[PDB]
Structure 1
């Protein structure tokens, strides 16, 4: 998802389930910077 961004930007996803979202913990990360830009109703984090 941090590479095929161009393809994911092509469609209006209803929701993102970001499983084990502790992966996103640092704002310095490209992952975080890019994952902010996708458009959806809800962003759902399932991180224990």
Structure 2
């Protein structure tokens, strides 16, 4: 891949997923993952 690691936040990712899925990743890093505690969330 031409550029390696991308830095993001949950408010962007829940809208931008359609763009991010245009590129594959080897590994996912998910920081303060308690942001995902609600399975009811759109996030």
> TM tier, shorter chain?
0.5 to 0.7
Q: How much is the aligned-residue C-alpha RMSD, in angstroms?
A: 0.6
TM-score between both structures, scaled by the size of structure 1: 0.60
- Runs of 4+, deviation exceeding 2 Å: none
The answer for unaligned runs of 5 or more in structure 2 is 1-12
The answer for unaligned runs of 5 or more in structure 1 is 32-48
Q: Radius of gyration: which is bigger?
A: 2
Q: Which structure shows the bigger proportion of residues in helix conformation?
A: 2
Q: Which structure shows the bigger proportion of residues in strand conformation?
A: 1
TM-score between both structures, scaled by the size of structure 2: 0.65
Alignment coverage as a number of residue pairs: 31
